[PDB]
Design a binder for this molecule. Structure first.
Ligand SMILES: O=c1cc(CP(=O)(O)O)c2cc3c(cc2o1)OCO3
Ligand SMILES: [Zn+2]
Ligand SMILES: [Zn+2]
Length: 229
């Protein structure tokens, strides 16, 4: 059940979880879809990733207003590329508290991104330091190691079977690992496996550029990344 809302697509994944999808014409690659998440936690809404642009991200907020009609308490963005952070200004214009890996905020200006307002830091084992992610409700934030980028982070949704790999994970039939321009090729495979081990009960793996898949997306992405070293 895809719902077309202007130029964006929304798909319900669970009673309190929806996937948002936006598109950007990349010259040389066609119109590239990017996915994020919208989660209702009681009387508030939590967002994972912006759309590619401010205008598209404002449209996500419009869809939330019409379809959920609860305040958006926070957004967390999963690395400093345009598909995930390109709409930061729209979140700030709306008064929404924003969070990203400290490293994503450090990298944002040179990537042409606007930094989030708050920085997440991570324990040695990858789990977010909880003091830096206050009021995250069911969102469980995990840094799996460098992969698609050095700053990529991932998010599980407690109380569901869903985990979000962002651009780290590709679907079980993907031919390649996509844009490796900022990737850590040596560590990618281990980081993909660490994501899987952090969320062992997640049977629905959501990712940036493909429809949700089974855990075969993780095993396949890791096996593909094995070839990178
Ligand atoms: O420089 C880039 C950056 C991105 C965004 P990201 O996905 O790496 O976060 C990008 C995305 C694409 C692509 C090429 C790309 O080139 O082709 C299919 O999707
Ligand atoms: Zn990226
Ligand atoms: Zn991507």
């Amino acid at each position: 059940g895809d719902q077309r809302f202007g130029d964006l697509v929304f798909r319900q994944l669970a009673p309190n979880v929806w996937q948002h999808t936006s598109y950007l014409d990349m010259p040389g690659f066609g119109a590239v879809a990017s996915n994020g998440l919208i989660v209702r936690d009681g009387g508030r809404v939590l967002v994972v990733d912006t759309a590619w642009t401010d205008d598209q991200t404002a449209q996500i907020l419009n869809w939330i207003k019409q379809e959920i009609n609860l305040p958006v308490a926070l957004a967390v963005v999963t690395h400093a590329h345009q598909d995930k952070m390109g709409g930061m200004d729209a979140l700030h214009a709306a008064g929404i508290a924003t969070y990203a890996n400290a490293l994503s905020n450090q990298l944002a200006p040179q990537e042409g991104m606007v930094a989030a307002q708050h920085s997440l830091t991570f324990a040695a084992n990858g789990w977010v330091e909880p003091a830096t992610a206050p009021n995250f409700g069911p969102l469980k934030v995990f840094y799996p190691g460098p992969g698609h980028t050095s700053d990529n982070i991932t998010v599980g949704i407690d109380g569901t079977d869903i985990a979000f790999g962002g651009c780290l994970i590709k679907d079980s039939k993907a031919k390649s690992l996509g844009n490796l321009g900022d990737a850590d090729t040596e560590h990618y495979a281990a980081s993909a496996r660490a994501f899987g081990a952090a969320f062992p009960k997640a049977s629905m793996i959501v990712m940036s550029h493909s429809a949700p898949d089974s855990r075969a997306a993780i095993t396949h992405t890791a096996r593909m990344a094995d070839k990178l070293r």
